[PDB]
Design a binder for this molecule. Structure first.
Ligand SMILES: Nc1ncnc2c1ncn2[C@@H]1O[C@H](COP(=O)(O)OP(=O)(O)O)[C@@H](O)[C@H]1O
Ligand SMILES: Nc1ncnc2c1ncn2[C@@H]1O[C@H](COP(=O)(O)OP(=O)(O)O)[C@@H](O)[C@H]1O
Ligand SMILES: [Mg+2]
Ligand SMILES: [Mg+2]
Ligand SMILES: [Zn+2]
Ligand SMILES: [Zn+2]
Lengths: 84, 97, 137, 689, 48, 595
């Protein structure tokens, strides 16, 4: 599970950044470490399970994003670089 | 030794000196450290290792790192008429490393 | 590395390195239990080497004897039912072993910047208890 | 069989008959005592019945010495006290005389409801007997009437409370018995073998809770049938009833909904107090323990924090309330149910003249020399120090409080400060004065600080409301507050003392608190010079650490120096070494008066309010002018602790009033002002040797 | 610090450390040898 | 129904009790005492595992390894003997050598379960002593009869039993109501305590281990938190470790604890438990004999710390402090001190700490403190904690624990004013007063003090007055009864002699001294005599009216000091009165210390 927060530069003046929760499955885990801006492609769905609807108050729901692809918005070398 | 706010587990964390083993540790405003920071810096520079005895844990960690520091003279201006030892708030044991 | 464990390793054998940061107190677990039924006093035993005490008395399915069939009925028409969870443990005739928990995390030198170290829970028993102390690699 | 039976040497019908006989027969060495009490109860002039076990023992011995048989009621009540309350109640309800005073518009509402209930009972009985007689189907008629009719039970028609008080040591010692109920015990000694008994505890009260109503029986009403339903409650919580349970609604198919009616319900006034051990009872190297006391009925508000008392009560169990995982069997908690309270030191407000007190007082005045005789009895183990003792006695007595009108206020309490060289026994005098006073408190420097003085915010366990717990200055209200090491305190404490001496209040403005406390208390302080011993080569104001104004804020400020002298040292050493050889003071021509008589006489004196005449006023103004003129020259030479100011005149007036009060007079005379000035001059001979 | 100075002065001779707090009091065993190194004031030793 | 093995074991233990006759007469003596003095003694005796070992090795091993099968038979046999010999059931306690079964909370494992153990450690927290309901008694008003019921639980017997959870009866068998008779019911006391590993034995830097102990009836309040204790009992398990029902959770195990039967407090250094020895008739004869010699004071003085050279007067003062005077309580309510205090200012190699540690090692109850080591709440017990029941409580400090003992302070001059004001009240009023949020109490702190201090200039100077050399408040010095100054002046003969002494060391015993001090303190309380009165009066007058420059001031405290020293010397003499010699000795010691 990963939490995404808006980039502070893009927030119009006077408002606060929003955020969401993201789900990464299989080989999408441990790809984006904290502190880097990324682009995430996924399916926007409710937390349909929730907990239960016997809870008092207005019937409101929480939502998540299930990620399909992730990308980033080095000190290694090779023979080509070694010769140079 | 400090709690993890999300996993609710105790953890052992070293300082920037332990974390930068085989690296470089940058310290800004070197003239404003407090007693604990001064002691940690002195131990790291003299022994290249940091000790700890806290919360039932006794161990030593490696602190083999390079240090680049910046400071300011007393009063904010350099007095060229006096030796460097009298221009900064630092002491000889640290300044000689 | 502790950070490389993942799904492919589940139920296999692994070799890991780290530093011990916490050992717990010794627990007690059973290796041999002698039990009895509080209604009809039928006795049996259990050996461990998630076991639970029987949900029902075992004197019916176990046709011990011909007179045991007689003993399982009495006083006119009423049937014999010992109830749910009829067994109790006779402690003075049982055997127990030792158990412990440990915590292992990654070496603090190589942790990535901006993130706290990861750790894992470990369980050992019998002759592997009280072997190390926190701060050991 | 399950629930077998057992045999005990206890017969309750015999004891009921004995109770009736005692209640109708006892004579005090006029008709029966308790019958007169019951008549007063019936006429609505009494609320509580006190049963003294000395009367029971006297009745038993009277019956024995003349031959006839009798049962041991005292021991039965002692060992099983909780059962005899209802036996006595039932016996008393069978003998109460009819009221000889009519019920009018100036009676309590409870009495009106009780009388209405009794009249309704009689009306139902008469209706039932008439209806049965008219049928044509006299002991049997009344029996059948009693069988078929409801009533209001006796507990809903009582108006009094009943308490027991223990067997005094004197009666048992004279009658050759062992009064268990009145042998004081510490909380440590009270174990589980004492449960269900009537026992006495000695301790000091630390906490008291506000009075609240505890419900005994709830009342409901049914509009469908018109019945009243009563639900007994003896638990910390209860479940209210929902649907009617009367005979009429029970037999029918459509039942009515009960509604709660507070006015018909039965309530009790409840308090819970904590009691802690005395120092002399705690073993070596241990911490004192506590105990819980329950108070119900007319006995509430009889305990205040800080009182050393001997509480009497029945020791009873309660359900367990600890952690579930640590419960091994049927564990219980203990509490005491209060039945009688006695104090080790009587309050002045509760004073009253009577033959017994009057004879002792009149003896004291007849003996003559009241002033010096009282003065010399304060800490008689300390040699010398006579004028300081006179000032201390006057601080005990106090002056006169004056309401000037327009809301203005002038105090009448006298503040005294002692300051001298090491080893002059200041602390002994502080402690002795604290012990003589009925509301005295003792403090020493940094041990008490911050909320130790003043008060703090905390939550009541019993009630669910916030409160303030008073500190040292609030616990000694209307008493003496003794402060040791006065010069070693922090600034905040000094400011609080300053304000308290100023206007008898403490103002606090902090997070969660904005209020004003009452501090009607006197201050008795002790201090040391700044360099240990006094240095006669320095100005007086340079030998002390306190501000000059604070010193000026004392009516009397004493200097006690230690100048070696081969003569007086001999007398002091003789006195001290004699005091160590024996346990008494050496003088034989003088007898010291014990603290109780001193307290009685001071309580009697405190009721007076002498007044100023004209000649005394002229003398006072002349003396004030002369003293004020003199003091300025001394203060210019840097040889005065402080220049005379109007506070000196007010202190002189207060001291004259105190002396007049001690003389038991309605007016002031010149000699009182003479003595006041004499003392205020004596205050400073140490500075002129 | 001064508290450390007092503690080590106790340790170097009686080879124990006495502890006294509000809920614990004990004497500990501290059998040890001390080897110290100091640097003189003014940054160099003066024979005057 | 009866069991044959049970009866055979009962018979064997009866034979054991027959062969050894000490326990038999012990039971007889307890019964005799309880009959004559009616305080009631509890019905219990102690058995030695060693004797059992010589007698029957099989029965010994059974009690050691299978207590649940062998101990109830022994208790029944003892009860049978007790019931047969006289004109509650009885219990047993165990002493002797437990061999491999003597452990500590760290080395107590699951392989020792169900066996009899003996553990050592420190008490950390006790519990409130509560009553437990055993038998209830009731009354029926309609019929006039009394009933009752019995109750039991799992911790009242060593062997497992089938539960019988009886209900509390409110009605009769015929439907009638019942009334509780609290005075005729029965309740038993109950407590639970915790024991930890000793601070002086546990590994450093490691979290400690602890175990719970359950006590009942007559062993309910035999210790307080902070004590060193030895508890012998049966390590036992209870309940089901999540086995019954599904109980998917597997982390928890079986609850374990110790059903204690023996509790022994142990004395250590710098602890609140005082040492006491048992005095035999040989010891009493020898002590009362030595009391009649004229140099007894000299011998007892020279016995103290014989490894140190000289300091004879300080040895005498330490002995006087060990013995002490008498305190007076007047009917009025006043209190007069009876303790003795000592101070030492000296050069930095004068063996002050050696004598201080000797006093720590020899006094029956002593606590060691250093200048900056303890401060604030750590001295007067001014710290507040609270139970999980809600109430706030206090816990003892250094001087609160050392009530009726001695306190050793090293590096005295390194203290501050905040704690010196605190110790003033201790040294004069011998009480501690606390006034915090929700507490107002006064604790007894009757203790003596011995301290050592350093001169201001590193070494004592004779060219300056004592005030410039001590630098301590006069009011504080007035509270010290004796002040000594020690200096080391180089001298060829003295240096030689101390050299041979220190070389001898490098290449009356204490226990008898402790017995002597205990007997003298417990038994003797002398009174003042007119002769000593005159002597002390003359000496006090002369001292107060002399021109000599002193090491300390003169007040009434000096007169009281003279009386205290005289009474303590008389206490040493085992005499019931003070003579002229004791007063003269006190005066001589005071004059030597002052001049
Ligand atoms: N005038 C006196 N008469 C009898 N005893 C005295 C006198 N002065 C001092 N003392 C004794 O000396 C001690 C003085 O201590 P304390 O009561 O604290 O007074 P202070 O605080 O002034 O020194 C007391 O124990 C007291 O018994
Ligand atoms: N009078 C003496 N007799 C025997 N040994 C002495 C004497 N004075 C000093 N010493 C030795 O010198 C050391 C002094 O240690 P310590 O007690 O700390 O002295 P101080 O506390 O005065 O510095 C001790 O180890 C002791 O063996
Ligand atoms: Mg004092
Ligand atoms: Mg020393
Ligand atoms: Zn069964
Ligand atoms: Zn109804």
């Amino acid at each position: 599970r990963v939490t995404l927060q808006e980039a502070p530069g893009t927030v119009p003046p006077g408002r606060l950044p929003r955020h969401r929760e993201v789900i990464l499955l299989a080989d999408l885990v441990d790809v984006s470490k904290p502190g880097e801006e990324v682009e995430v492609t996924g399916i926007y769905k409710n937390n349909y399970d929730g907990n239960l609807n016997a809870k008092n108050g207005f019937p409101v729901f929480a939502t998540i994003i299930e990620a399909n692809s992730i990308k980033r918005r080095v000190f290694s070398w090779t023979e080509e670089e070694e010769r140079e | 030794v400090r709690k993890d706010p999300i996993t609710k587990e105790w953890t052992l964390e070293g300082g920037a000196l332990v974390l930068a083993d085989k690296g470089v540790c940058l310290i800004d405003e070197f003239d404003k450290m407090n007693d604990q920071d001064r002691t940690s810096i002195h131990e790291a520079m003299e022994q290249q290792s940091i000790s700890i005895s806290k919360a039932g844990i006794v161990t030593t960690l490696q602190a083999r790192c390079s240090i680049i520091a910046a400071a300011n003279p007393n009063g904010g201006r350099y007095n060229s008429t006096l030796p460097l030892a009298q221009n900064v708030s630092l002491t000889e044991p640290i300044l000689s490393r | 590395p502790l950070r490389d464990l993942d799904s492919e390793h589940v139920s296999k054998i692994v070799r890991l390195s780290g530093i011990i940061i916490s050992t717990s107190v010794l627990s007690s677990r059973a290796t041999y239990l002698s039990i009895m039924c509080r209604n009809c006093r039928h006795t049996t035993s259990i050996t461990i080497n998630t076991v639970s005490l029987p949900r029902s008395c075992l004197s019916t399915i176990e046709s011990e004897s011909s007179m045991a069939n007689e003993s399982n009925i009495g006083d006119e028409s009423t049937k014999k039912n010992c109830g749910p969870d009829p067994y109790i443990i006779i402690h003075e005739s049982s055997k127990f072993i030792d158990q412990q928990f440990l915590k292992l995390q990654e070496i603090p030198e190589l942790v990535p910047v901006g993130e706290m170290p990861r750790n894992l829970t470990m369980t050992c028993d019998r002759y592997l208890t009280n072997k190390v102390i926190p701060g050991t690699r | 069989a399950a629930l077998p039976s057992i045999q005990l040497p206890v017969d309750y019908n015999n004891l009921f008959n004995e109770i009736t006989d005692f209640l109708v027969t006892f004579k005090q060495d006029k008709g029966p005592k308790y019958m007169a009490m019951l008549q007063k109860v019936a006429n609505r002039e009494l609320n509580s019945v006190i049963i003294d076990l000395d009367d029971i023992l006297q009745y038993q011995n009277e019956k024995f010495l003349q031959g006839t048989q009798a049962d041991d009621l005292v021991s039965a009540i002692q060992q099983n006290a909780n059962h005899f309350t209802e036996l006595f109640c039932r016996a008393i309800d069978n003998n109460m005389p009819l009221p000889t005073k009519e019920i009018d518009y100036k009676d309590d509402v409870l009495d009106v409801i009780l009388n209405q209930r009794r009249l309704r009972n009689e009306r139902m009985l008469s209706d039932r007997t008439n209806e049965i007689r008219s049928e044509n189907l006299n002991d049997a008629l009344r029996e059948v009437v009693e069988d078929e009719t409801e009533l209001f039970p006796p507990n809903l028609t009582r108006r009094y409370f009943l308490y027991f008080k223990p067997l005094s040591q004197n009666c048992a010692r004279r009658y050759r018995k062992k009064a268990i109920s009145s042998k004081p015990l510490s909380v440590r000694q009270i174990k589980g073998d004492f449960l269900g008994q009537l026992i006495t505890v000695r301790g000091i009260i630390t906490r008291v809770s506000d009075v609240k109503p505890a419900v005994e029986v709830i009342a409901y009403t049914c509009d469908q049938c018109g019945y009243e339903v009563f639900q007994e409650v003896n638990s910390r919580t209860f479940t209210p009833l929902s649907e009617c349970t009367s005979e009429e609604c029970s037999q029918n198919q459509t039942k009515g909904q009960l509604f709660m009616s507070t006015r018909a319900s039965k309530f009790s006034a409840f308090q819970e107090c904590k009691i802690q051990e005395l120092s002399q009872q705690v073993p070596v190297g241990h911490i004192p323990r506590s105990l819980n006391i329950h108070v119900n009925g007319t006995l509430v508000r009889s305990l205040s924090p800080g009182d050393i008392v001997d509480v009497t009560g029945i020791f009873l169990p309660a359900p367990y309330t600890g952690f579930k995982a640590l419960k091994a069997g049927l564990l219980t908690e203990t509490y005491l149910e209060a039945q009688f309270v006695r104090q080790h030191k009587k309050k002045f407000a509760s004073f009253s003249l009577t033959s017994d007190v009057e004879e002792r007082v009149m003896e004291l005045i007849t003996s003559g020399d009241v002033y010096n005789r009282l003065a010399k009895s304060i800490a008689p183990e300390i040699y010398g120090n006579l004028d300081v003792k006179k000032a201390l006695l006057l601080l005990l007595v106090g002056g006169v409080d004056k309401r000037v009108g327009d809301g203005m206020k002038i105090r009448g309490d006298i503040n005294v400060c002692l300051m001298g060289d090491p080893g002059v026994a200041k602390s002994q005098l502080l402690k002795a004065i604290c012990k003589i006073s009925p509301r005295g408190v003792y403090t020493t420097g940094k041990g008490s600080s911050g909320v130790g003085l003043t008060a703090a915010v905390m939550k009541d366990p019993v009630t669910d409301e916030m409160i303030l717990e008073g500190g040292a200055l609030v616990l000694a209200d209307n008493g003496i507050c003794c402060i040791d090491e006065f010069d070693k305190m922090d600034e905040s404490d000094r400011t609080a003392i300053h304000e308290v001496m100023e206007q008898q209040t403490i103002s606090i403005s902090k997070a969660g608190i904005n209020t004003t406390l009452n501090a009607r208390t006197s201050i008795l302080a002790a201090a040391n010079p700044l360099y240990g011993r006094y240095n006669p080569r320095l100005s007086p104001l340079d030998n002390i650490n306190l501000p000059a104004a604070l010193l000026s804020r004392f009516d009397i400020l004493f200097l006690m120096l230690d100048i070696p002298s081969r003569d007086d040292d001999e007398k002091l050493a003789e006195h001290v070494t004699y005091v160590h050889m024996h346990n008494k003071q050496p003088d034989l021509d003088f007898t010291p008066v014990e603290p109780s008589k001193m307290r009685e006489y001071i309580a009697y004196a405190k009721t007076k309010r002498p007044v100023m005449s004209e000649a005394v006023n002229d003398y006072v103004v002349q003396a004030y002018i002369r003293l004020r003129q003199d003091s300025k020259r001394e203060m210019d030479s840097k040889f005065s602790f402080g220049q005379a100011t109007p506070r000196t005149l007010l202190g002189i007036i207060r001291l004259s009033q105190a002396l007049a009060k001690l003389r038991l007079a309605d007016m002031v005379d010149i000699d009182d002002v003479e003595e006041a000035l004499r003392l205020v001059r004596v205050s400073k001979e140490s500075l002129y040797q | 610090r001064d508290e450390d100075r007092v503690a080590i002065h106790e340790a170097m001779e009686q080879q124990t450390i006495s502890i006294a707090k509000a809920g614990i009091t004990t004497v500990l065993n501290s059998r040890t040898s001390v080897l110290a190194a100091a640097n003189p004031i003014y940054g160099r030793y003066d024979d005057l | 129904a009866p069991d044959a093995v049970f009866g055979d074991r009962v018979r064997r233990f009866q034979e054991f009790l027959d062969t050894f006759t000490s326990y038999r007469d012990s039971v007889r003596s307890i019964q005799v005492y309880n009959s004559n003095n009616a305080n009631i003694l509890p019905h219990r005796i102690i058995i030695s595992l060693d004797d059992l070992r010589e007698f029957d090795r099989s029965f010994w091993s059974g009690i050691l390894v299978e207590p649940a099968y062998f101990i109830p038979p022994a208790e029944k046999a003892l009860t049978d003997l007790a019931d047969s010999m006289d004109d509650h059931p009885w219990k047993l306690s165990f002493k002797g050598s437990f061999g491999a079964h003597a452990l500590s909370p760290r080395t107590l494992t699951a392989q020792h379960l169900n066996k009899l153990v003996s553990v050592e450690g420190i008490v950390t927290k006790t519990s409130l002593v509560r009553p437990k309901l055993i038998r209830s008694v009731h009354y029926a008003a309609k019929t006039g009869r009394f009933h009752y019921r019995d109750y039991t639980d799992a911790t009242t017997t060593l062997t497992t039993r089938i539960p019988t959870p009886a209900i509390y009866p409110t009605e009769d068998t015929e439907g009638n109501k019942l009334t509780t008779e609290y005075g005729y019911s029965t309740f038993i006391d109950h407590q639970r305590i915790t024991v930890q590993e000793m601070p002086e034995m546990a590994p450093a830097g490691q979290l400690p281990r602890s175990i719970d102990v359950i006590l009942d009836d007559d062993l309910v309040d035999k210790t307080k938190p902070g004590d060193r204790v030895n508890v012998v009992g049966v390590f036992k398990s209870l309940g089901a470790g999540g086995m019954n029902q599904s109980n998917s959770n597997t982390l928890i195990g079986f609850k374990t604890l110790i059903l204690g039967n023996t509790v022994y407090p142990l004395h250590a250094r710098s602890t609140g438990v005082a040492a006491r020895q048992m005095l035999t008739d040989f010891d009493i004869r020898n002590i009362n004999k030595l009391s009649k010699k004229k140099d007894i004071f000299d011998i007892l003085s020279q016995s103290l710390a014989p490894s140190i050279y000289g300091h004879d007067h300080i040895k005498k003062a330490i002995l006087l402090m060990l013995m002490g005077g008498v305190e007076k309580n007047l009917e009025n309510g006043s209190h007069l001190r009876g303790d003795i205090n000592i101070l030492m200012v000296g050069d930095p190699s004068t063996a002050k700490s050696q004598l201080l540690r000797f006093v720590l090692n020899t006094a029956s109850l002593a606590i060691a403190t250093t200048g900056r080591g303890s401060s604030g709440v750590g001295l007067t017990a001014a710290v507040t904690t609270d139970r999980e029941t809600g109430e706030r409580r206090l816990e003892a400090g250094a001087m609160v624990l050392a009530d009726r003992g001695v306190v050793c302070i090293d590096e005295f001059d390194k203290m501050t004013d905040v704690d010196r004001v605190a110790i003033h009240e201790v040294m004069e009023q011998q009480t501690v007063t606390i006034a915090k949020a929700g507490i107002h109490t006064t604790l007894n702190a009757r203790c003596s003090v011995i301290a050592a201090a350093n001169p201001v200039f590193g070494q004592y100077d004779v060219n300056r007055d004592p005030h410039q050399n001590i630098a301590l408040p006069d009011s504080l010095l007035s509270r010290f009864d004796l002040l000594f100054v020690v200096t080391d002046d180089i001298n060829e003969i003295r240096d030689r002699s101390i050299s041979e002494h220190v070389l001898r060391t490098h290449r009356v015993t204490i226990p008898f001294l402790r017995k002597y001090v205990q007997y003298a303190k417990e038994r003797v309380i002398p009174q003042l005599t007119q002769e000593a009165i005159n002597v002390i009066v003359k000496n006090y007058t002369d001292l107060r009216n002399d021109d000599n420059t002193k090491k300390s001031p003169i007040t009434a405290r000096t007169l009281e000091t003279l009386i205290r020293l005289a009474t303590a010397h008389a206490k040493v003499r085992l005499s019931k009165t003070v003579n002229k010699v004791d007063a003269k000795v006190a005066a001589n010691l005071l004059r030597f210390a002052l001049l």
